[PDB]
């Protein structure tokens, strides 16, 4: 009996920590200077709510003319991890267009996604309050989480929550 595979796409402005969160989930260490242009896909066998499954994760990078793989992942993506950085209001503001574009490509009014405020270790440099991130997520009726790839806070939980959202769809 084959386990279900979930295709997940991590999106967000450059520098928010898409690679660092994805590499923390897969390899369980914190990267500091990962190439901002590398667009890799990753796999991981996990159990979520005690149902084993496979995660198929595209770690998007840059906004150059997309590869055919990115376009396929955008069309076939089952859940989206929409990442901003709590120290960058600009990265949160860009989330609104990431959601429009996901809903545009998927051609539906609602697509499983989670709003992730990353770098929650940078409390000194916080621009986006938790309350404001919760307000965006409540407005879009999506789950919300603050994460730290650096301090390993809620990394697995963010991905697992996205799977729980897909399973409710
Ligand atoms: N303090 C802190 N820095 C982070 C965190 N996540 C990523 N970074 C840093 O932010 C920079 C960009 O991270 P990266 O994952 O490459 O962002 P990406 O362009 O979305 O892939 C890197 O230097 C990371 O060390 C975090 O949770 N906390
Ligand atoms: Mg990256």
Numbering used by the authors: -1 to 167
Article passage:
Consider, for example, the Ras proteins, which are prototypical members of a superfamily of membrane-associated small G-proteins that control an extraordinary range of cellular processes. Ras proteins are capable of producing a diversity of signaling outputs by binding to effector proteins, most importantly to the Raf family of kinases, which activate the MAP kinase pathway. Ras proteins cycle between an active GTP-bound state that transduces signals by binding to effector proteins, and an inactive GDP-bound state that cannot bind to effectors. The switch between the GDP- and GTP-bound states is accompanied by correlated conformational changes distributed throughout the structure of Ras. Two segments of Ras, referred to as Switch I and Switch II, undergo substantial rearrangements when GTP is replaced by GDP, as illustrated schematically in Figure 1 (for a comprehensive review, see Vetter and Wittinghofer, 2001).
There are no structures for an invertebrate Ras protein in the protein databank. We expressed and purified Ras from the choanoflagellate S. rosetta. We crystallized Ras from the choanoflagellate S. rosetta, and determined structures bound to GDP and GTP at resolutions of 1.85 Å and 1.6 Å, respectively. (B) Sequences of Ras from choanoflagellate (S. rosetta) and sponge (A. queenslandica) are 72% and 80% identical to human H-Ras, respectively. Human SOS stimulates nucleotide exchange with S. rosetta Ras and H-Ras with comparable rates, but only when GDP bound to Ras is exchanged for GDP in solution. When the exchange reaction is carried out with excess GTP in solution, the reaction shows a marked acceleration in rate for human H-Ras, due to the allosteric stimulation of SOS by Ras•GTP. In contrast, S. rosetta Ras is deficient in allosterically stimulating the activity of human SOS.
